Homo-oligomer: A and B are copies of this chain.
Amino acid sequence: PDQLLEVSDEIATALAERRPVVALESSLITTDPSSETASLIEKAVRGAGAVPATIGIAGGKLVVGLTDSLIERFASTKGIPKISARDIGGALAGGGLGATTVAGTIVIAERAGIQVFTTAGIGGVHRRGEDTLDISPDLLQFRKTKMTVVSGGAKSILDHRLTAEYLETAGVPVYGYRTDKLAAFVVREADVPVTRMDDLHTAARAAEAHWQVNGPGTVLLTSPIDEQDAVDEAIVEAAIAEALAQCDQEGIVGNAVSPYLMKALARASGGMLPKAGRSLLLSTARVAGEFSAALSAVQAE
């Protein structure tokens, strides 16, 4: 066996039976102590017949399927570090809890044999990232790990066009589910083309041929936020450009800039930002569950 991995009975049975599983990250389970969200998300994933697998680090182990005991700790403990792939080693050595990010979670999901992962938005090239080189580790982790990541594109505070250019340079396939424009998190679209897939069985056959030809690597399937739930591009951009405008005059750069952009976004959105992010989270999870079903059936032939 594997001495680092602890996989729940349900997930281990689904994998043994080549049934559909969808991985979920823990780094944000922390952002909703309720849980109510995790419950709508599990429901969205199972509605397709997929098994949800929430992932994190605890006790020197990579945990696939957190126990209720564990979800409780992740919900209620103050000090929990966010763990990208490069932090996994130290999180294991330390023996405490670690809430894994996109890059951290997909490496653990892949190690267990899970092939689909979902979240509302991935990391990317930050705004002014062509100058500061502040770019999420998710983008190059997608050159190594065999995974389909289903999301609503990059998070809104990031630079959508630069992230799309970087993924193209990195050779990472970017598909749009029923669209040929890149999803822009709580904003419907960025003016960036992607390859339209109208059907998830076609997307799954494309992903499978991608792995067979190019080897282990991530396929990004973007699915935009429901049009009824979108935030106005103008509102998002003006709020962000102003938040950056205050950054220059108060002279803040570095890891300080990014959490200001996040708070400025909450503010401009009435109080709708959480509501829009939840809608995107739910619809993306549904698509991930349906995609994972369609991939199990493709790999079955």
Task: Please tell me which stretch of A41-49, A171-179, A243-251, A270-278 contacts chain B, meaning at least 4 of its Cβ atoms lie within 8 angstroms of it.
Answer: A171-179
Using a CB–CB cutoff of 8 Å, the interface residues on chain A facing chain B are 4, 62, 84-90, 92-94, 103, 107-108, 111, 125, 130-137, 139-141, 143-144, 161-162, 165-166, 168-175, 195, 197, 202, 205-215, 219, 254
8 Å CB contact of A107 from B168, B207, B211, B213: B213
8 Å CB contact of A213 from B4, B94, B162, B174: B4
A106 to chain B, nearest CB (A): 11
Contact A93 B206, beta carbon cutoff 8 Å: yes
Contact B209 A87, beta carbon cutoff 8 Å: no
User: What residue in chain B is nearest A141 (Cβ atoms)?
Assistant: B171
Contact B133 A209, beta carbon cutoff 8 Å: no
Contact B89 A207, beta carbon cutoff 8 Å: yes
A176 to chain B, nearest CB (A): 11
Residues on the B chain within 8 Å of A140, using CB: 143, 169-171
Contact A169 B132, beta carbon cutoff 8 Å: no
Apart from A133-B166, A139-B169: 7 A-B pairs, beta carbons within 8 A = A4-B209, A87-B195, A90-B206, A90-B210, A92-B206, A107-B214, A133-B165
A7 to chain B, nearest CB (A): 15
Q: State in angstroms the CA–CA spacing of A275 and B137 once bound together.
A: 37
Contact B89 A173, beta carbon cutoff 8 Å: yes
Residues on the B chain within 8 Å of A85, using CB: 171, 213-214
Q: State in angstroms the CA–CA spacing of A175 and B135 once bound together.
A: 20
Q: State in angstroms the CA–CA spacing of A90 and B144 once bound together.
A: 20
